[PDB]
Amino acid sequence: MSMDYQDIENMQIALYKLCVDWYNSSPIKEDIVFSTHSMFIAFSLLYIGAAAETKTQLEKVFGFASIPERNFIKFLQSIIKQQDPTMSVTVDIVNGIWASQKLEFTEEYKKAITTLDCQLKNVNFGNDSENIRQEINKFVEEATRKVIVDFLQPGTISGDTIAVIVNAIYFKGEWETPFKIVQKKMKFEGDEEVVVMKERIECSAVFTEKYTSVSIPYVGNQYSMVIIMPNNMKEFEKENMGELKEYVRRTIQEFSEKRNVTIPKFKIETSFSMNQQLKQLGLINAFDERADFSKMAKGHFCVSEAIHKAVVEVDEKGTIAAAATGIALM
């Protein structure tokens, strides 16, 4: 429950690198939401079973080897399980594995998934694929308090499926200072007049040539939404995305001042098939017979489908955010 400071820094670097890399490799353009935190956790469960070049490629994309191997499962526990109380805020991270009754997990793999409190079900994909899809979708719906529905679409799983790894994340926080909806709509650059919300709030904000940022606190001031608004989105995209970690750090470090903050009311939902994007990021062997998951189970397994869905809802009262990541092996 208390990691070395350098190791925390190493994982901050890896998780921001994955976030920016996912953004930079994405095909969906002007409006997008995702949880690379969810992706990391789901793929962490695959990586625990990886060996050889599959292990190395997962390490390259997700940053899993940024910390000692003997602390890997403990780091996962540190991000899945509650460390400090969340108070009024809800943060719920759950994992589930549905494995063919024909799959024999290694002793090491079974121990890790039990240590991580990962739900494990042994199921019959050969005849029950549709029912299993519904069960997984119900699991995600419950974990996300109904925000992520019908996560796995028909066809994602089949009679040839051998395992499905699912991570879900649910976040619910009220703004420390509730916003008031502004009576008049506000012109948003490149868009239209939109409903905005405003209040005099106590917040950290940075005003620089490249961007304006604000950290909008949730009740308790332990979680926040950090908004980074470039002065020129395209230039920022081309040159500054790599220092997202430091722009967040600088924003949180700045003094809080009592100031007016105006932001749009907004909801965003994004779905995608991850496979092609992951290959472009360098995860190649996992998707065919070169896959080496010899630490997971005996046999010859590979990833058929990797799926992500995320939703963020921002209103005058607070934020609800949910995401799921599914990995189906053949």
Binding site: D31, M225, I228, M229, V248
Partner: protein, 34 residues
């Protein structure tokens, strides 16, 4: 007097806790609640 913040141009957001790990990330260019 403290400078106001008006989010009136395309923006990124991240949801973070004390470890500052990005729990969620997005970009908004056309804000809608539908």
């Amino acid at each position: 007097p403290p400078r106001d913040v008006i989010i009136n141009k395309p923006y990124f957001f991240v949801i973070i806790g004390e470890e500052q790990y990005p729990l969620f990330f997005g970009k908004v260019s056309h804000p809608r609640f539908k």
